[PDB]
Structure formats: structure tokens, C-alpha cells
Design an enzyme around this catalytic site. Structure first.
Site, PDB file in Angstrom:
ATOM      1  N   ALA A  98      10.780  28.381  23.301  1.00  0.00           N
ATOM      2  CA  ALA A  98      11.884  28.312  24.239  1.00  0.00           C
ATOM      3  C   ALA A  98      13.162  27.671  23.649  1.00  0.00           C
ATOM      4  O   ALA A  98      14.054  27.427  24.452  1.00  0.00           O
ATOM      5  CB  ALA A  98      11.516  27.584  25.512  1.00  0.00           C
ATOM      6  N   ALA A  99      13.218  27.563  22.333  1.00  0.00           N
ATOM      7  CA  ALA A  99      14.419  26.955  21.732  1.00  0.00           C
ATOM      8  C   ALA A  99      15.597  27.897  21.991  1.00  0.00           C
ATOM      9  O   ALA A  99      16.649  27.485  22.480  1.00  0.00           O
ATOM     10  CB  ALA A  99      14.239  26.684  20.251  1.00  0.00           C
ATOM     11  N   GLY A 100      15.328  29.159  21.648  1.00  0.00           N
ATOM     12  CA  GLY A 100      16.367  30.174  21.819  1.00  0.00           C
ATOM     13  C   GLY A 100      16.774  30.299  23.259  1.00  0.00           C
ATOM     14  O   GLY A 100      17.960  30.457  23.607  1.00  0.00           O
ATOM     15  N   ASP A 101      15.799  30.331  24.185  1.00  0.00           N
ATOM     16  CA  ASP A 101      16.127  30.470  25.593  1.00  0.00           C
ATOM     17  C   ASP A 101      17.013  29.315  26.102  1.00  0.00           C
ATOM     18  O   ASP A 101      17.937  29.546  26.857  1.00  0.00           O
ATOM     19  CB  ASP A 101      14.846  30.482  26.456  1.00  0.00           C
ATOM     20  CG  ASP A 101      13.975  31.702  26.125  1.00  0.00           C
ATOM     21  OD1 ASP A 101      14.537  32.742  25.749  1.00  0.00           O
ATOM     22  OD2 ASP A 101      12.735  31.590  26.304  1.00  0.00           O
TER      23      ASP A 101
HETATM   24  N1  LIG Z   1      13.799  22.754  14.048  1.00  0.00           N
HETATM   25  C1  LIG Z   1      14.864  22.723  14.853  1.00  0.00           C
HETATM   26  N2  LIG Z   1      15.508  21.550  15.027  1.00  0.00           N
HETATM   27  C2  LIG Z   1      16.594  21.499  15.877  1.00  0.00           C
HETATM   28  N3  LIG Z   1      17.144  22.468  16.565  1.00  0.00           N
HETATM   29  C3  LIG Z   1      16.460  23.614  16.359  1.00  0.00           C
HETATM   30  C4  LIG Z   1      15.353  23.793  15.551  1.00  0.00           C
HETATM   31  N4  LIG Z   1      14.921  25.039  15.548  1.00  0.00           N
HETATM   32  C5  LIG Z   1      15.731  25.630  16.351  1.00  0.00           C
HETATM   33  N5  LIG Z   1      16.698  24.865  16.923  1.00  0.00           N
HETATM   34  C6  LIG Z   1      17.570  25.212  18.018  1.00  0.00           C
HETATM   35  O1  LIG Z   1      17.248  26.414  18.638  1.00  0.00           O
HETATM   36  C7  LIG Z   1      18.255  27.423  18.387  1.00  0.00           C
HETATM   37  C8  LIG Z   1      17.532  28.747  18.189  1.00  0.00           C
HETATM   38  O2  LIG Z   1      16.592  28.648  17.085  1.00  0.00           O
HETATM   39  P1  LIG Z   1      16.011  29.970  16.405  1.00  0.00           P
HETATM   40  O3  LIG Z   1      14.743  29.724  15.691  1.00  0.00           O
HETATM   41  O4  LIG Z   1      16.974  30.558  15.396  1.00  0.00           O
HETATM   42  O5  LIG Z   1      15.896  30.881  17.720  1.00  0.00           O
HETATM   43  P2  LIG Z   1      14.602  31.556  18.392  1.00  0.00           P
HETATM   44  O6  LIG Z   1      13.675  30.503  18.881  1.00  0.00           O
HETATM   45  O7  LIG Z   1      15.308  32.370  19.557  1.00  0.00           O
HETATM   46  O8  LIG Z   1      13.930  32.379  17.350  1.00  0.00           O
HETATM   47  C9  LIG Z   1      18.986  26.901  17.137  1.00  0.00           C
HETATM   48  O9  LIG Z   1      20.268  27.515  16.924  1.00  0.00           O
HETATM   49  C10 LIG Z   1      19.023  25.383  17.480  1.00  0.00           C
HETATM   50  O10 LIG Z   1      19.934  25.101  18.552  1.00  0.00           O
HETATM   51  O1  LIG Z   2      10.919  32.609  24.658  1.00  0.00           O
HETATM   52  C1  LIG Z   2       9.713  32.003  25.165  1.00  0.00           C
HETATM   53  C2  LIG Z   2       9.128  33.072  26.131  1.00  0.00           C
HETATM   54  O2  LIG Z   2       8.876  34.281  25.414  1.00  0.00           O
HETATM   55  C3  LIG Z   2       7.914  35.006  26.213  1.00  0.00           C
HETATM   56  O3  LIG Z   2       8.635  35.684  27.192  1.00  0.00           O
HETATM   57  C4  LIG Z   2       7.046  33.961  26.943  1.00  0.00           C
HETATM   58  O4  LIG Z   2       6.919  34.288  28.324  1.00  0.00           O
HETATM   59  C5  LIG Z   2       7.804  32.644  26.770  1.00  0.00           C
HETATM   60  O5  LIG Z   2       8.083  31.898  27.963  1.00  0.00           O
END
Ligand SMILES: Nc1ncnc2c1ncn2[C@@H]1O[C@H](COP(=O)(O)OP(=O)(O)O)[C@@H](O)[C@H]1O
Ligand SMILES: OC[C@H]1O[C@H](O)[C@H](O)[C@@H]1O
Ligand SMILES: Nc1ncnc2c1ncn2[C@@H]1O[C@H](COP(=O)(O)OP(=O)(O)O)[C@@H](O)[C@H]1O
Ligand SMILES: OC[C@H]1O[C@H](O)[C@H](O)[C@@H]1O
EC number: 2.7.1.15
Lengths: 306, 306
Positions: A249-252
Site C-alpha cells: 500500500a505504499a503506492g496507494d
Molecule cells: N523503502 C521505502 N522507504 C520510504 N518510502 C518508500 C519506500 N518504498 C517506497 N516508498 C514510498 O512509496 C512510494 C511508492 O513506492 P514504489 O515501490 O515505487 O511504488 P509501488 O508500491 O506502487 O510499487 C515511493 O515514491 C515513496 O513515497
Molecule cells: O496495493 C495494495 C492492494 O493491491 C491489491 O489490490 C490488494 O487488494 C491490496 O490491498
């Protein structure tokens, strides 16, 4: 701030923590197990509502038990759940998720009732989309509905923000309607054909997307932050250095909080920093949707950042 | 035929079919989704009961809804479910399973109430185990309970059959109590340290296990059948050539049907062929527990095999 409409999925996440992901034909004994509400749509709607947005969510749930309980939960996250429809005779979308010892995850989803969010249900929300300042969408909802909503927004000068996840190629017709696109490196490659492993590759991939009609391109780079590009001019905005325990859920979180800051009229670099702060908190917490921070926590994190 | 006691796990399997397994940090959109009863214990108990065994099952379920529904289902598979205990305040074990386009699977389990099947609950079944002709167990139940039951069986001349799955190293104290052991190639390696990629390696690994006190060693070789070894003398017994669509529960079916044929006094090679026939049917069918064949189907398959 203006008003936000999020349109996307709602899933029942089943998440098992284990040491290492199982390899083919293997069974691995995990530890912690949780069922929680999730979905990229709902996670971004919650990130927006908890961070302070004025947000309404267009989504479809089934009428299984989790479907009938999820709207009540989402309303408490400051989300207007009027446009969350309950689809009779269908079950809510599901995700099966493994989270390893390092905090990485692998996810497999089943659409379920998210597949009932159709062009006709989008068309029933035409005024809501037309009246909004921004529309945020992902790719866990039917492509045709994403396209129908992007068109309505485009016509009414509603900002179209698309987080193109999970990865897939998209028609030029849809990409021409997007104002803000937020791929991760895998998605940027799927959309343009350019592998992104550095800031030079990020600018290359960003340019293809600008060439598709998209003015603001934000390519997320994991712990390296984001390549931010507006109609050609780009820069890297680092994220915060934290101890990641669960990156789900970082991206979300980044997307929902990003749009909240933009609708408060914070310029792009400042909105990205706000979103980086929200996502940095989220990766230090277990679970997906439960890990999304509230406005007061995000500000407290930024206030300590000197 | 003599009587069989199966002691092992009961899980709620959540299974998602997809094209390819998700790689780290990826989300993959799957197709078919099913929740069904499973667990290596229950799958082997069902394979034994459906193939004709006189079988009773020692297991623990939670008192969640699936826990309260699973005993009723298992009783219909000709299984005496008297020794299936329902653990109040706990949930039934869970498996999250992905099945790819080729029919391979990856499984992550959470013990749940299977972890409540303790040495004290084993000790409460002492007479049942002592009176049985054979005891069949797997490694989805606490090691201490497996050991407690193997000891009771050993004392009373009850055959101890152990399917050492999922893979882990086992104490020499437990291996000395096993009469029949049925590792796959990964498990044989974990137990002996010898990688098994051919019949020569299979004999090597078999010898270590015979050196631990185990008279009958059956190392399963996937589509290549099984290396059968009795106190040193070994041979390969090929399986049947079929079009695999879902290999899940192949091993479980092989074990339950294997013991049914042995308790009908079929010599080992013939019991292995009967089990190979049951498992061959199972791999041509979707799902785990639902894919286990009935006695009339196994015989019809063998009757056509000329
Ligand atoms: N290890 C981390 N430490 C701190 N912030 C992070 C880290 N990983 C990701 N993020 C945060 O989450 C955002 C999305 O990470 P990313 O991996 O590129 O996206 P996704 O989870 O959608 O694949 C980053 O731009 C940053 O804000
Ligand atoms: O980005 C995290 C989400 O990806 C998938 O949709 C899962 O439901 C999870 O909550
Ligand atoms: N592709 C196959 N075709 C036919 N029978 C098979 C096939 N794969 C496995 N089997 C049956 O299942 C048994 C166990 O297979 P194996 O892969 O070694 O075990 P496990 O599923 O426990 O890892 C085999 O000995 C055979 O009876
Ligand atoms: O062997 C198949 C079984 O392994 C795991 O126990 C799952 O529950 C599944 O039913």
C-alpha cells in the site's frame, strides 16, 4: 480544497506473513494471518480521506458479508460512500497476499464484483465526475469504465489522475485523456517499452508518456523517491529514509495523499513531499489499508523533518 | 482390511488460478477463485475413505463457520470424524494457494487450530492408535504430537506411515519410529542432504533413511513415478501418463490410497500402482480435496489400463 472522486476496486485482502515466498510446488508455513479490507481503489480513497481530502468513491462491492460491512468502514475514513454500489448475487473482489520477512509482497487478485463497475454505472455518476476537481483511478476496474470516466472528466475540465497499476498496456485513446500519471518502474516499462533503472531512463520513459498527451508524469522509484516530469522538464524528489517493515500500500498511500495536497493548491514538489511523508509512514506499518496514515500524523512527521 | 488412523491438518483452502505466479512486488490478476476444505491431513483422510479404507481421523478445527461445517463434509467421505475436535476460541487453519496456467501451485499455510492438536489430545486417542493397523501422518501438525503418536503406534505394532511434508529436518528419535516414509524429492534432500534428480540419487537418499531405522522408503518422483525401497532393495515404479491440469493434492491422494491398498493386503508394488492410479486421476482434475477419486473410479481406471 476542491472535491475528489476516486473510482476503483474494493477487495477482501487475505494476507499471510512468511519468511520467504514459496517456490513452485512448495508449501511454506507462514506466521501471522489477517483478513482486512483493501483494493487499490479503496486504499487510495482511504489515503485521500484520512489525509484531509473532500472525497467520494465510485466502486462496487458484492453482497457477501464483507461487502455489506466495507461501506460502513469506509464512511469512517471521511469518504462519501454514496456511489459505492452493492451488487446482488455477487461476491466482493478478493486478494491473496504473501508478505515476506523483508516486507516485500506478492499479490494475486480476483475481480469479483469490481467487474460490475461498468460504463453504465460510470454514466450514472456523470454529474458527480463533471463537478469534481479531480478524478483518481487505478487498473483494478474494467478498462472500459476507466475510459468512460476519463472521457467525462476530460470534457468537464476535471483533472484525470491515473495510477496505472497493476501493469498493462493501455490504448492511446485512454492515455490522451490522462493529466497526471503515476507509474512505478515496471508500469512505466509496460506503458512505453523503456526499462527504468535510473534517472536517465526515467526521463526517457516520461517523454514517451508526454508524447501520448500526458502533461504530468510521476515515475515512482521505490526507496529512491520519484522522477517528477511536467511537459518535459524533470527532477528527482527523494522520499524519506525510514525502516521499512511492510511496503504494501505504499503506492496507494502516495497517490491518495498526493491528490489531497494538489487539491489544497500545494505546488507539485510540495504535494509530492506530503505524499512521500504519508507513504513513508505507511511502509513502517503492517498491513495495507490499516497502514494508511491520518492527516495529523503526516503533519507531525513533516514537522519533525529538519 | 485392518483399520487406519489418519492424524493431521484441516485447512480452509483459498485458491486462485492465474497464468503466472506473481514475482516480488507485483500484483497479478487471476481468474477462478474458490474456497474449499483442504489440509494434508484431511486430503489424505479423504483419499483413504473414498478409496475404501476403514479410517478415523484425529484432527482439530476451529469453531469459525468453516470449522463447524467441515466435520459434516468429511463424514460423507466414509471417515469416522469422532476424533476431530472443535477448538473453541480459535479459527481453522488456512492455506492461500496460487495455481498457474501449467497446473503447478505455490502454497502458504497458517496453522490456526491445527496447532491445538497436542500431545495430550494424542494421548487421549492412545487406545484408538494402539488398536489400529496403521497410522498415517504428515508435518502440518505439531512435531511433538506426531512424535507422541508415532511412539504409541510403535509400542502397539501399529504401522507408522509418515508423509514428511511440508519439508523439514526431523529428529532421529522420530525417524526411528517410522515404518513407511514417503518423501518427494525436495523432502528426501531435506531429510538426508542428498539431492535427488535420478534413480541413483534416489537409492542414495533411501539408504540414509533405511540407516535411520525406516524399512520402507518411497521417494516420489513427480511424473516419473516412485523409487520404492524396502530395507535396501529398490526399484522405480512408473506412474500413469496423463494430461495434468492441476497437480495439487497429488501427493495426498497417493498416500491415502497407498495405505488403503496396503491394509487390503495388496503387496507393495500393487499398492503403489493403485495409488498411482488414484493420483493420476487427481492430477487431471481441478482443486485439491475435490479432485480425490472414489474407489469405483480408481478401479475403472485400472481396468482400462492394458
Ligand atoms: N523503502 C521505502 N522507504 C520510504 N518510502 C518508500 C519506500 N518504498 C517506497 N516508498 C514510498 O512509496 C512510494 C511508492 O513506492 P514504489 O515501490 O515505487 O511504488 P509501488 O508500491 O506502487 O510499487 C515511493 O515514491 C515513496 O513515497
Ligand atoms: O496495493 C495494495 C492492494 O493491491 C491489491 O489490490 C490488494 O487488494 C491490496 O490491498
Ligand atoms: N504429472 C503427473 N502425471 C501423473 N501422475 C503424477 C503426475 N505428477 C504426479 N503424479 C502422481 O502423484 C504422485 C506424487 O507426485 P509428486 O510431485 O512427486 O508429489 P507431491 O505432489 O507430494 O510433491 C506421483 O508419484 C504420481 O502418483
Ligand atoms: O497438499 C495440498 C494441501 O497442502 C496444504 O495443506 C493445502 O491446505 C492443500 O489442501
Amino acid at each position: 480544497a476542491g472535491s475528489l472522486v476516486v473510482l476503483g476496486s474494493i477487495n477482501a485482502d487475505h494476507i499471510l506473513n512468511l519468511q520467504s515466498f514459496p517456490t513452485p510446488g512448495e508449501t511454506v508455513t507462514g506466521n501471522h494471518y489477517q483478513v482486512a479490507f483493501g483494493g487499490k481503489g479503496a486504499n487510495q480513497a482511504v489515503a485521500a480521506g484520512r489525509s484531509g481530502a473532500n472525497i467520494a468513491f465510485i466502486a462496487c462491492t458484492g453482497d457477501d458479508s464483507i461487502g455489506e460491512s466495507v461501506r460502513q468502514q469506509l464512511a469512517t475514513d471521511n469518504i462519501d460512500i454514496t456511489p459505492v454500489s452493492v451488487i446482488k448475487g455477487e461476491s466482493t473482489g478478493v486478494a491473496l497476499i504473501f508478505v515476506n520477512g523483508e516486507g516485500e509482497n506478492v499479490i494475486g487478485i480476483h475481480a469479483g464484483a469490481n467487474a460490475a463497475l461498468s460504463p453504465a454505472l460510470v454514466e450514472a455518476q456523470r454529474e458527480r465526475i463533471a463537478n469534481a476537481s479531480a478524478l483518481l483511478m487505478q487498473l483494478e476496474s474494467p478498462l472500459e469504465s476507466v475510459m468512460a470516466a476519463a472521457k467525462i472528466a476530460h470534457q468537464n475540465k476535471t483533472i484525470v489522475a491515473l495510477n496505472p497499476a497493476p501493469a498493462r498496456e493501455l490504448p492511446d485513446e485512454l492515455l490522451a485523456l490522462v493529466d497526471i500519471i503515476t507509474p512505478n518502474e515496471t508500469e512505466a516499462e509496460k506503458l512505453t517499452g523503456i526499462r527504468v533503472e535510473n534517472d536517465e531512463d526515467a526521463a526517457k520513459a516520461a517523454q514517451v508518456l508526454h508524447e501520448k498527451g500526458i502533461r504530468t508524469v510521476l515515475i515512482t522509484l521505490g526507496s529512491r523517491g520519484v522522477w517528477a516530469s511536467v511537459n518535459g522538464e524533470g527532477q528527482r524528489v527523494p522520499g524519506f529514509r525510514v525502516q521499512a517493515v511492510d511496503t504494501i500500500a505504499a503506492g496507494d498511500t502516495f497517490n491518495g495523499a498526493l491528490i489531497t495536497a494538489l487539491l489544497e493548491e500545494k505546488p507539485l514538489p510540495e504535494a509530492i513531499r506530503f505524499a512521500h511523508a504519508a507513504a513513508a509512514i505507511a511502509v513502517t506499518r503492517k498491513g495495507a489499508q490499516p497502514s494508511v496514515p491520518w492527516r495529523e500524523e503526516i503533519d507531525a512527521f513533516l514537522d519533525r523533518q529538519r
